[PDB]
Amino acid sequence: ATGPRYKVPMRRRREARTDYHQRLRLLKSGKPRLVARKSNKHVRAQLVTLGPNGDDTLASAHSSDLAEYGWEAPTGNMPSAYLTGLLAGLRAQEAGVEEAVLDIGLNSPTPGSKVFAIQEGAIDAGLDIPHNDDVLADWQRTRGAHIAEYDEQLEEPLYSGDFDAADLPEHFDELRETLLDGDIEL
Amino acid sequence: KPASMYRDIDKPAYTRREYITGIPGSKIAQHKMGRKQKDADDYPVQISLIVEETVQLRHGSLEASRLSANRHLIKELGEEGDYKMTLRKFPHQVLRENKDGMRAAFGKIVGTAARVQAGEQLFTAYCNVEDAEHVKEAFRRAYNKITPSCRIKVERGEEL
Amino acid sequence: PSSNGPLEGTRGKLKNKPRDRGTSPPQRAVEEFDDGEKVHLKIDPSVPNGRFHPRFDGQTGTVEGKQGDAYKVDIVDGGKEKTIIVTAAHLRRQE
Amino acid sequence: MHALVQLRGEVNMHTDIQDTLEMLNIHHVNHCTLVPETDAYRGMVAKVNDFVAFGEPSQETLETVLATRAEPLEGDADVDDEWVAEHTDYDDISGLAFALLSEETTLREQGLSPTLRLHPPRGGHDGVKHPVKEGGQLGKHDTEGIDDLLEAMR
Amino acid sequence: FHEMREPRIEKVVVHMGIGHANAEDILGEITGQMPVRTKAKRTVGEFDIREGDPIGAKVTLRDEMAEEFLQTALPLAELATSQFDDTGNFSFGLDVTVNLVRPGYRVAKRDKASRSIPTKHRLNPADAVAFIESTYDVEV
RNA sequence: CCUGUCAAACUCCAAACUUACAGACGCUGUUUGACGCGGGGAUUCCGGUGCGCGGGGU
RNA sequence: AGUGCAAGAGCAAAAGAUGACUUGACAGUGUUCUUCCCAACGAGGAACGCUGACGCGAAAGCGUGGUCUAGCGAACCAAUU
RNA sequence: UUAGGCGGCCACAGCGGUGGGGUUGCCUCCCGUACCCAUCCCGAACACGGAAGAUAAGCCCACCAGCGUUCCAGGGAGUACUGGAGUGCGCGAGCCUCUGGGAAAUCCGGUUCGCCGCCACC
Numbered sequence: 004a005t006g007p008r009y010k011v012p013m014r015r016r017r018e019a020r021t022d023y024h025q026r027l028r029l030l031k032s033g034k035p036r037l038v039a040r041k042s043n044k045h046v047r048a049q050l051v052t053l054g055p056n057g058d059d060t061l062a063s064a065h066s067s068d069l070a071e072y073g074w075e076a077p078t079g080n081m082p083s084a085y086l087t088g089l090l091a092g093l094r095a096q097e098a099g100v101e102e103a104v105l106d107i108g109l110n111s112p113t114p115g116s117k118v119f120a121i122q123e124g125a126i127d128a129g130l131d132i133p134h135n136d137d138v139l140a141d142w143q144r145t146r147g148a149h150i151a152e153y154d155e156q157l158e159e160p161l162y163s164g165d166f167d168a169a170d171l172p173e174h175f176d177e178l179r180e181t182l183l184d185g186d187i188e189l
Numbered sequence: 190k191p192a193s194m195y196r197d198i199d200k201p202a203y204t205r206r207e208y209i210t211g212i213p214g215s216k217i218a219q220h221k222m223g224r225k226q227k228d229a230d231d232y233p234v235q236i237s238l239i240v241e242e243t244v245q246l247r248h249g250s251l252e253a254s255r256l257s258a259n260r261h262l263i264k265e266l267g268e269e270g271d272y273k274m275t276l277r278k279f280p281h282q283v284l285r286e287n288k289d290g291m292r293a294a295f296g297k298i299v300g301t302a303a304r305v306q307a308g309e310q311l312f313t314a315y316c317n318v319e320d321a322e323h324v325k326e327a328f329r330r331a332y333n334k335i336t337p338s339c340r341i342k343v344e345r346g347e348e349l
Numbered sequence: 350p351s352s353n354g355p356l357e358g359t360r361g362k363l364k365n366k367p368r369d370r371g372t373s374p375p376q377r378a379v380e381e382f383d384d385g386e387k388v389h390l391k392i393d394p395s396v397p398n399g400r401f402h403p404r405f406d407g408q409t410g411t412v413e414g415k416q417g418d419a420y421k422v423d424i425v426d427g428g429k430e431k432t433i434i435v436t437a438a439h440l441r442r443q444e
Numbered sequence: 445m446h447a448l449v450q451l452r453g454e455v456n457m458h459t460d461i462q463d464t465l466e467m468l469n470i471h472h473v474n475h476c477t478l479v480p481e482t483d484a485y486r487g488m489v490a491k492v493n494d495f496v497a498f499g500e501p502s503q504e505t506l507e508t509v510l511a512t513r514a515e516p517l518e519g520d521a522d523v524d525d526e527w528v529a530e531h532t533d534y535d536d537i538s539g540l541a542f543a544l545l546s547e548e549t550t551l552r553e554q555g556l557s558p559t560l561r562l563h564p565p566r567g568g569h570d571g572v573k574h575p576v577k578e579g580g581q582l583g584k585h586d587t588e589g590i591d592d593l594l595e596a597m598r
Numbered sequence: 599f600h601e602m603r604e605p606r607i608e609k610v611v612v613h614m615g616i617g618h619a620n621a622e623d624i625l626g627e628i629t630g631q632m633p634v635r636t637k638a639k640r641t642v643g644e645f646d647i648r649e650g651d652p653i654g655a656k657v658t659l660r661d662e663m664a665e666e667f668l669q670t671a672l673p674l675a676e677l678a679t680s681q682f683d684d685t686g687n688f689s690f691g692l693d694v695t696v697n698l699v700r701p702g703y704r705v706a707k708r709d710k711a712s713r714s715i716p717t718k719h720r721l722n723p724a725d726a727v728a729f730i731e732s733t734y735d736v737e738v
Numbered sequence: 739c740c741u742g743u744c745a746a747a748c749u750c751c752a753a754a755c756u757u758a759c760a761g762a763c764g765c766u767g768u769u770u771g772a773c774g775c776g777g778g779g780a781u782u783c784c785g786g787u788g789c790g791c792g793g794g795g796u
Numbered sequence: 797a798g799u800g801c802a803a804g805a806g807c808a809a810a811a812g813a814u815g816a817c818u819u820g821a822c823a824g825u826g827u828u829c830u831u832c833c834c835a836a837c838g839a840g841g842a843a844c845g846c847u848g849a850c851g852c853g854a855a856a857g858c859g860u861g862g863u864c865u866a867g868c869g870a871a872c873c874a875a876u877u
Numbered sequence: 878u879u880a881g882g883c884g885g886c887c888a889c890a891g892c893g894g895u896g897g898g899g900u901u902g903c904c905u906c907c908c909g910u911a912c913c914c915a916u917c918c919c920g921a922a923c924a925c926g927g928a929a930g931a932u933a934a935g936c937c938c939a940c941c942a943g944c945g946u947u948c949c950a951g952g953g954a955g956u957a958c959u960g961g962a963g964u965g966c967g968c969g970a971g972c973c974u975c976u977g978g979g980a981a982a983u984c985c986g987g988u989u990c991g992c993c994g995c996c997a998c999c
């Protein structure tokens with residue numbers, strides 16, 4: 004910009020997307036990165052391996068294509084986050100992927116978060132990812148007990164779209180049951 | 190000291206003052222002579238003094254050939270004549286002299302010189318048409334105080 | 350010279366041009382080479398660890414196995430054989 | 445196909461240029477070799493420029509040279525049409541001379557020594573100090589210019 | 599277009615810098631939150647040589663606790679024209695500084711894919727004066 | 739803006755050239771065995787000069 | 797800018813600063829390069845491994861000292877385990 | 878890719894600026910703190926829960942070259958410098974002929990306002 008002396012950063016550092024310093028440490032393991040990226044409305048879960056011209060995705064999972072199985076509930080929450088992770092690891096079991104690491108990128112390592120719910124979900128799918136069981140959320144915040152004890156504090160409804168009144172975190176249980184089944188169209 | 194010791198270019202480029210200390214200042218006073226308020230383009234004539242041989246002229250030889258050269262233009266055209274003379278070279282090359290024996294041979298700092306390649310203009314004057322034969326004479330005196338044989342070249346002037 | 354250290358007279362080879370400054374890309378730093386493969390030896394000024402002796406910059410060796418994550422490269426220094434321990438960051442695939 | 449002929453001695457000439465000359469089958473002064481025009485062979489004759497004399501010969505001249513100066517790979521014998529006919533892959537001297545010029549086969553391939561050992565110039569050469577352009581004898585000659593030398597060196 | 603362009607109060611910063619402690623009490627009284635100490639850099643000869651030492655005290659007010667403070671803070675100072683920044687900010691004073699801004703300043707203060715706010719969407723000095731003039735006081 | 743010059747310990751530039759490896763051409767080796775390896779015996783560690791590049795010195 | 801100190805070199809969601817935690821400046825044993833271009837030579841040094849015990853982090857991972865190149869010493873003898 | 882995720886190359890991608898684009902779609906700004914987590918003070922951020930509105934941001938899409946960067950033409954220039962040879966010139970520093978290479982500056986004219994990979998997706 005100022006002259007030939009000026010150093011313009013790397014593209015995905017300029018864009019403030021990829022953190023190369025932390026990303027390097029992830030690649031040092033050899034195992035594929037379980038890319039866990041959040042969104043306001045949805046949540047994504049990718050399985051990425053390192054390639055010649057760029058990163059190869061072997062198994063993705065968006066919370067949009069979760070509705071395709073039996074979901075009418077919102078897509079950017081804790082019950083959804085586990086199930087997006089569970090789907091991802093299940094697809095990956097069929098791709099030959101035995102083990103993987105967790106990449107959160109620019110997402111913060113906060114105890115009991117959506118990324119740590121995606122990580123928990125993928126491990127439960129049969130994958131071997133390095134974790135720490137106590138940093139993960141307890142079976143209940145993963146189920147959706149915290150959202151139910153917020154809909155109990157009513158006066159005015161939580162959800163706008165015609166789904167239900169007091170909210171059903173049982174839909175979590177109803178999905179994990181049919182995802183552990185081998186018949187399911189992945 | 191005889192210029193025969195420093196006239197040739199054989200020593201490396203020794204100009205960095207952040208490494209060389211105790212350097213004697215320039216003997217030269219004015220690099221821009223005449224009427225320095227007027228432009229060089231306001232003049233029909235541009236006669237320069239061209240150096241034929243690749244030399245290394247000292248600040249003393251520069252001051253001396255600038256002095257008796259400009260002093261002819263102050264004599265013939267007056268103290269405020271219609272001219273402007275210029276010395277486009279600057280003394281950067283720092284000189285040495287070993288002054289014991291050959292033990293600790295790196296000499297102490299004595300003076301400064303300017304590296305002039307062959308074909309270059311040491312001096313360049315810009316005058317009027319009638320004052321031209323006075324400047325070709327200010328340069329005939331100026332080449333006698335420097336080391337090489339010289340060409341007096343007219344760069345602008347088909348008025349003959 | 351004035352000194353006999355490793356980084357003697359290495360201003361030019363161990364310094365990048367202003368545009369190639371900053372942190373280096375992880376793609377080459379995690380590159381996997383096989384045994385028998387040909388490599389080019391060039392030290393990356395951004396990367397400090399996993400280097401070799403500056404006297405070997407510009408060598409074209411042959412990989413003969415690895416030591417952890419770093420590579421063991423076989424060169425011929427004049428006439429004497431040498432087995433250089435170098436990380437991928439400081440290697441480049443030949444041809 | 446050019447005709448390289450060594451005109452300057454081995455003394456005082458570089459080891460890397462003396463080895464190139466030897467790689468081009470030339471070891472003594474006045475010794476000649478028939479060299480193809482490749483990229484590899486182009487850079488060899490250039491490094492040897494100042495100690496040699498070269499150019500493409502005429503079908504006429506090469507024939508006169510081969511007759512008087514060519515020898516077998518091993519042997520003292522004359523190389524005439526009858527010799528050529530029985531060892532080589534050609535009918536007469538001309539079919540060898542043509543194939544050599546068109547760059548199809550070499551002297552080695554035909555059982556002949558890669559060296560045409562010539563006699564010192566009759567009338568003397570033009571000078572081992574200056575090139576062809578300055579009226580000397582070193583470097584790339586004219587087709588007619590090289591013929592004068594090889595024929596003077598019968 | 600006007601709704602996603604009309605400004606609002608982001609952070610009201612109140613600061614009291616002494617250099618030699620007592621100023622923490624009167625801010626916990628007028629605002630409505632816990633205050634924080636301010637340290638400094640570089641050695642100064644006016645008995646301010648120490649680096650890691652409590653010199654000042656400040657507070658940042660977000661949302662409701664910002665507007666409720668300004669209802670009593672603005673009818674005190676005589677607002678001028680040459681008291682404004684190029685980005686559309688003012689400071690009056692005890693120091694009180696308000697950071698007014700457009701409905702999309704999360705883009706510059708977030709983590710994931712940050713970007714700076716363009717010169718075409720940045721708050722204008724004059725457009726900032728017009729916003730405050732519209733809520734209980736005068737300009738000039 | 740206009741205008742005048744520099745850099746062995748400066749660099750947005752930048753050769754010629756030098757250099758690692760590989761292919762090919764040449765050359766060399768497979769009874770003159772190269773390349774390599776092991777062993778025995780040395781002499782030698784006052785150098786000089788021409789050309790090219792130098793650093794010091796009138 | 798800073799990064800202890802010469803100079804050259806490295807460095808920015810860091811190798812810099814602040815905060816908290818921590819003591820890997822840990823034990824043992826090697827490959828390699830260097831010291832000594834090529835090309836034999838000690839001490840010292842550096843990169844890189846492995847076995848053991850720790851520190852930190854969610855995790856990859858990083859830590860065999862302070863970002864790299866100076867701060868070092870054979871035998872005998874003296875003390876110590 | 879009618880707005881997504883991960884990247885490789887790491888300014889041909891910078892800087893600056895014009896224009897256009899979103900009913901249950903995507904991405905956002907945006908709304909809100911019971912919880913998980915959070916600020917040495919602030920739900921600003923960080924984390925979490927959610928859609929009243931929104932295309933003005935960002936981002937995605939079309940375009941401008943004024944600055945910076947890449948490459949190409951022609952001009953400078955086969956000039957500066959140079960590998961090899963010379964009983965070629967100069968008192969000398971130095972120059973020159975022949976052979977093989979070959980710049981940088983700057984000027985005008987063009988190019989460049991990113992290319993490609995894996996995945997997901999009316």
Ligand SMILES: [Cl-]
Nearest residue numbers: 040041042710
């Ligand atoms: Cl994300």
Ligand SMILES: [Cl-]
Nearest residue numbers: 401402433829
């Ligand atoms: Cl090494």
Ligand SMILES: [Mg+2]
Nearest residue numbers: 358359360361
């Ligand atoms: Mg150098």
Ligand SMILES: [Mg+2]
Nearest residue numbers: 515517518519
């Ligand atoms: Mg014979």
Ligand SMILES: [Mg+2]
Nearest residue numbers: 565566567568
């Ligand atoms: Mg005769």
Ligand SMILES: [Mg+2]
Nearest residue numbers: 569570571572
């Ligand atoms: Mg003669």
Ligand SMILES: [Mg+2]
Nearest residue numbers: 870871872873
């Ligand atoms: Mg003793």
Ligand SMILES: [Mg+2]
Nearest residue numbers: 874875876877
């Ligand atoms: Mg003791």
Ligand SMILES: [Mg+2]
Nearest residue numbers: 896897898932
């Ligand atoms: Mg628009």
Ligand SMILES: [Mg+2]
Nearest residue numbers: 965966967968
């Ligand atoms: Mg002479």
Ligand code: NA
Nearest residue numbers: 289290292293
């Ligand atoms: Na003495």
Ligand code: NA
Nearest residue numbers: 370371372373
């Ligand atoms: Na770099």
Ligand code: NA
Nearest residue numbers: 635636652917
């Ligand atoms: Na404090």
Ligand code: NA
Nearest residue numbers: 782783784785
């Ligand atoms: Na000797």
Ligand code: NA
Nearest residue numbers: 831839840841
């Ligand atoms: Na040692």
Ligand code: NA
Nearest residue numbers: 932933934935
């Ligand atoms: Na917009």
